[PDB]
Amino acid sequence: SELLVNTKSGKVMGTRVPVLSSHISAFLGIPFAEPPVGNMRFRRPEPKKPWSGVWNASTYPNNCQQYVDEQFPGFSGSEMWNPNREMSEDCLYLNIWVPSPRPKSTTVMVWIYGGGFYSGSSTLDVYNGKYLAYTEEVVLVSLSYRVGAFGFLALHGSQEAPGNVGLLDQRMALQWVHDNIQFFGGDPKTVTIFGESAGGASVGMHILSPGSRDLFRRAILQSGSPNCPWASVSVAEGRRRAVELGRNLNCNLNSDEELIHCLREKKPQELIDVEWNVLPFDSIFRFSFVPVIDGEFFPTSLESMLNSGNFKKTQILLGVNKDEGSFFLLYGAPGFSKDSESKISREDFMSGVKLSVPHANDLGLDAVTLQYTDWMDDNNGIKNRDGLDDIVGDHNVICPLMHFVNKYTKFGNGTYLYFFNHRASNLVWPEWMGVIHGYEIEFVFGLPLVKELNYTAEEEALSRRIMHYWATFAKTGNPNEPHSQESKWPLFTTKEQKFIDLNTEPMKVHQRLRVQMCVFWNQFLPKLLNAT
Amino acid sequence: SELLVNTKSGKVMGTRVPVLSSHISAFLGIPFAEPPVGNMRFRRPEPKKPWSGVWNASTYPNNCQQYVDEQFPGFSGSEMWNPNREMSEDCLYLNIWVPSPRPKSTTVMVWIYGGGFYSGSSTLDVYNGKYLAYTEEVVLVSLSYRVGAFGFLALHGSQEAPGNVGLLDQRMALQWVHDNIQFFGGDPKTVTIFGESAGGASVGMHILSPGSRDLFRRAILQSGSPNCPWASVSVAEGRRRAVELGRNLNCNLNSDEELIHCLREKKPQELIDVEWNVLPFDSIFRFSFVPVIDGEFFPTSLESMLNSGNFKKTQILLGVNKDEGSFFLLYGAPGFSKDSESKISREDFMSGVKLSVPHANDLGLDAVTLQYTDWMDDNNGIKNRDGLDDIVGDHNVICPLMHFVNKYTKFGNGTYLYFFNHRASNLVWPEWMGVIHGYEIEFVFGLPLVKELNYTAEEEALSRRIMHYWATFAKTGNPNEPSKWPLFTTKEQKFIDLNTEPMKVHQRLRVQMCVFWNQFLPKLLNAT
Ligand SMILES: *[C@@H]1O[C@H](CO)[C@@H](O)[C@H](O)[C@H]1NC(C)=O
Ligand SMILES: *[C@@H]1O[C@H](CO)[C@@H](O)[C@H](O)[C@H]1NC(C)=O
Ligand SMILES: *[C@@H]1O[C@H](CO)[C@@H](O)[C@H](O)[C@H]1NC(C)=O
Ligand SMILES: *[C@@H]1O[C@H](CO)[C@@H](O)[C@H](O)[C@H]1NC(C)=O
Ligand SMILES: *[C@](C)(O)CCC[N+](C)(C)C
Ligand SMILES: *[C@](C)(O)CCC[N+](C)(C)C
Ligand SMILES: C[C@H](O)CCC[N+](C)(C)C
Ligand SMILES: C[C@H](O)CCC[N+](C)(C)C
Ligand SMILES: [Cl-]
Ligand SMILES: [Cl-]
Ligand SMILES: [Cl-]
Ligand SMILES: [Cl-]
Structure with a gap:
């Protein structure tokens, strides 16, 4: 049975899903960790313990507790990023799309949603993995992780709320892929992790953390890097904010045990309602609970690690969009x-x-x-x-990423940089916003391939080439197919620093992306x- | 006689000079102060004591003692700025050009040479005033002033070497014009002072200094303003350099009098030989002995005077050249x-x-x-x-000048700004240097009007419209005779290009x- 697979934790039953006149297997809502509920809140994740019987994996799982954007009620442009499933702290699950018939030992790609580390879901329509998995014949995994306070409350010293548990949730999902993906036709020796924004910063953080390095082969970062000003805080700032969250709820601040105890008694929505009050200043592109430079997940400062080459050395494909700041x-x-x-x-x-x-x-x-x-x-x-x-x-995305690409390339084994500047013909957002943060994702997941979505013929072609670039990169470490005819995406070198634009026009090679x-x-x- | 004039200090005999197939009167080397020699070195200038008989004013005077540029021997590009006659501490003289026949109460223009306060002469070929005086029919005066330590050694507190004597020399020359120009057909109530580089900074400083304000009507500043970073120093820095000058010459440094007496015994060239050793850093566009903010010639800091509006309020016309830094x-x-x-x-x-x-x-x-x-x-x-x-x-000329123009305009009575960007066709310097600092002067003085100098016909025309803008401005406060050179205003901040092409108006000169x-x-x- 193609749909019945037994993992190290128990059996799972997928479902047959239609896709572009064909079909593929889908395993939705597979648990990889124990529900981080109750006394587990803020705590490091624990492996999902074995279950009996067949786990029904035909429907999407719940989304993690998070802030919900209600600025534009009914507006698709903003709601397409809100949870489309019931929210619950019991949200540590992953989704898998397997080609049919099941491949033997094929390339695997794991998706890490973004959302400023305070939001995000693995179940959004824009993340439907059937189109990519089907078109490029890869095993596509969609993981999840705790966001906001639930996933990044940091009170360094304590083992109840150590911080970075959200990043640890990701690692555990990768550990799961490493141990069970072979059962779905994927080669655990060829896994590419990719994500956008906070997801992109995450991918770069795994490249840096010694505990994540051996859990993947290559990495793709879209509009996000580990060194972004909004992607992390000092243990001191993390504690300060953690304590501020307690003060906002009239919590006993006499000690971490009491503070944490108080915060574990609160309802999810109670935490979320005051989440933004703990920020240092009035600001934009700044989030309350994010990864912390703990000296554990991250041995030393991100900068010192980039300078010494203390990180996984492999191939990476990264880039940004033309108008990152408008949103x-x-x-x-x-x-x-x-x-x-x-x-x-x-x-x-x-x-x-x-x-x-x-x-x-x-x-x-x-x-x-x-x-x-x-x-x-x-x-x-x-x-x-x-x-x-x-x-x-430039401040929040582009320059931090350029810093990253230049430092990494000095030690890495292959760098490919892109500049996505295509304004979709069917964008619902105003013209002044341009090529918006996050809108290259629909092209990456092939949404332009579905007729009723009304993309142009040239947008479908653009989508197909981006997916092929991503997939081919995942399989070989080079987005280009050797001895092929099409224009070649050149390697980014410390000396020439080349990069290509990504749009519907013929390829163009540039140099020194926004150096000035x-x-x-x-x-x-x-x-x-x-x-x- | 048209050449014999009785001034309040004595008689002077000029000389009839040729100019563009015609002639005009020239009075060269007229003393306006007592020779600041011997114990008068470093001391404020004293008015020239009357003389008997007729003073021979037919030939140029001596140039003040100064460093001489020997970088390119024989090269006319650098030598045209070097003293073209004997150097001497007895150099406080002035030159006058009067049109023939002698006019009545006509406009006067007083030229103040530049040279970073460490050099310059009123006798240079490019400062020959006959062309401008004749063509525009104005009485043209070129003055002189002590440069280098001789004119700016500053030991605030002492009255033997108080600092700023060079500016005081300029003032005495203007005071002399105020008392005697009428005798040459000049109109003392319509005097315009103009200068380039350090000369422009001087003009600016006179606009600021109370003791100078009543000695002129309007001003023109060319590639220089009072607030330039190289144009002045604090009393503290002036004293430091002064003391360091003595040290370099093994002087007794126990006190001002001992230091000064020692420096007064040295020969001119001994001072000049070590002049540059007193600068505090290795640098360019920086000069040893310059004006000092002494609380006397300059009441308070230049900036505070500019903000309070404490300065002469009149019409000014100023500008810069495209490539001020190459030189x-x-x-x-x-x-x-x-x-x-x-x-x-x-x-x-x-x-x-x-x-x-x-x-x-x-x-x-x-x-x-x-x-x-x-x-x-x-x-x-x-x-x-x-x-x-x-x-x-931008740092040494253009931006300091724009800061001055914007501050002045708030209280002034009329501002006209220009951007000189014409590359002379017969320039002897290499092309990379572009429109060089100081090369608009030859156009202001009508040199292009003389055939043998081989300028293009377009450059001659450029020179004629420039001389007319200058002269008309000097006599009315407006370079335009009733393409119009717009007025620089705080709001629109307009200025014009000055080249061989039809006038073009712009706004916010190098504002970024x-x-x-x-x-x-x-x-x-x-x-x-
Ligand atoms: C699994 O869940 C799907 C959707 O609720 C349902 O159609 C299917 O019958 C379920 N399988 C079993 C036998 O639990
Ligand atoms: C990657 O590493 C291999 C093996 O050491 C080496 O041969 C190759 O040149 C490297 N490629 C790049 C682009 O650094
Ligand atoms: C003035 O001096 C010049 C040059 O020394 C001389 O030619 C001239 O005759 C003198 N004046 C007269 C006429 O005495
Ligand atoms: C100059 O002053 C006169 C009289 O005080 C005044 O009428 C005129 O507007 C002023 N000119 C400018 C442009 O300031
Ligand atoms: C990034 C900071 O994680 C922001 C991601 C935002 N969306 C809207 C693209 C999900
Ligand atoms: C200004 C600093 O006084 C410099 C003027 C230089 N010359 C060469 C034009 C006299
Ligand atoms: C990026 C974003 O919508 C910030 C969340 C909005 N506030 C701070 C108003 C709750
Ligand atoms: C431009 C000019 O003559 C600078 C003076 C040269 N040194 C410093 C050598 C005396
Ligand atoms: Cl950079
Ligand atoms: Cl002649
Ligand atoms: Cl000589
Ligand atoms: Cl105004």
């Missing part, structure tokens, strides 16, 4: 609106920069402002909007803020 | 040469900025570097050369870079 400006910066061209006055521009770089001193602010202001036309509402868009995206601004963000600004 | 890079920065394109390597670029902003810390240097480096092509030699060229010019040099860097250096 976040729309939600937290004045002057921005979904139903308007959002021309930003000078007053709001100033406010935006303060909001975008919350940790900067007045001098740092002036520096950012001067670096992104055309003083021959400072009141230009459009230049001010786009300026802010670039500030947010990134030199500012990665070299000059830090030195300025470090002075006094 | 100084050629002389003190590695990688530059007069006989090559001078592509600057990356290492030399680094060295260059350090030399350009000697006072900046490492963060400041990184800031200047990032601000002027295209990181998509950092190893481009031409881009590094031009970048260094803009750094030196100047925002960096006038607001961000200062703030960054004060914070770190």
